[PDB]
Design a protein around this ligand. Sequence first.
Ligand SMILES: NC[C@H]1O[C@H](O[C@H]2[C@H](O)[C@@H](O)[C@H](N)C[C@@H]2N)[C@H](N)[C@@H](O)[C@@H]1O
Ligand code: NI
Length: 282
Amino acid sequence: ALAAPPGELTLALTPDDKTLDPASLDRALAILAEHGILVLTGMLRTRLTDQLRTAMLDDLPEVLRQQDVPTNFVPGHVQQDPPVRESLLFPDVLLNPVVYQITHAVLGADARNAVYSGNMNLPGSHEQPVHLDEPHLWPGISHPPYCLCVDVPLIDFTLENGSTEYWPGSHVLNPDECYDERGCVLPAELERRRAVAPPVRFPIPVGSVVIRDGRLWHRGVPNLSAAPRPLLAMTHYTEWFDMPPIQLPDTVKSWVDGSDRHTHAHFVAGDVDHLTGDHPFA
Ligand SMILES: NC[C@H]1O[C@H](O[C@H]2[C@H](O)[C@@H](O)[C@H](N)C[C@@H]2N)[C@H](N)[C@@H](O)[C@@H]1O
Ligand code: NI
């Protein structure tokens, strides 16, 4: 019911900021440890978010033409990969120096991005169940994080247009028989948790970047606006967690492969089909 992101969760920047001073970084880490979600305002320029927003709304028709449209949990929550064309792969988005500074500190210098995907929340979408995007490695065990979701809204997220319900501090909870095979939280454990630390939902301005634990409870909620709500989604993992590589064109290999901000990527000659992944050599 907030009119902006809570201060407990938020850290304000300009796009020119390339690192956090030690005091800011310790705070960012302290938030991800305690709350499991960190909102970074003013990270990305309009020039980038605009091109990416345009590119994904242009692709949405090709996505909805598909015989079976891939959704997450309920109708209206479409899985859509953004394009991997030389011209729409920006270093400030894939290899953001502030994001990787936080993820290196949390997951290790060998941590790597292994997801370049998206969530198109359509008008009249349904309520998702509360869930983990990425599960705990064993039931009934406390362990540190092995993955951080990096969510990039491509329009102003509002209460009406489907800003995500987040459950702060839920990333460290992992009792027995808590999660089912799709990673949905059992209803008993929700109501116990709602009493101690209830969910929050808030606007997130475009140009913001949200970093959160992969294990954080959350649910997508109905888009009641007249416009699709695109989200570009990356996920950094520890070196040792097994993931299939991101299909990228060799036209970007030059700067992506060199970097000490690691991507788990496989480079193909020529164009890559993000949408349906039909490209001949995977
Ligand atoms: N790293 C965050 C993302 O993780 C999940 O999606 C993955 C999901 O983990 C896989 O089952 C699927 N094969 C790919 C999909 N993109 C979530 N369902 C997405 O909503 C979220 O964008
Ligand atoms: Ni989710």
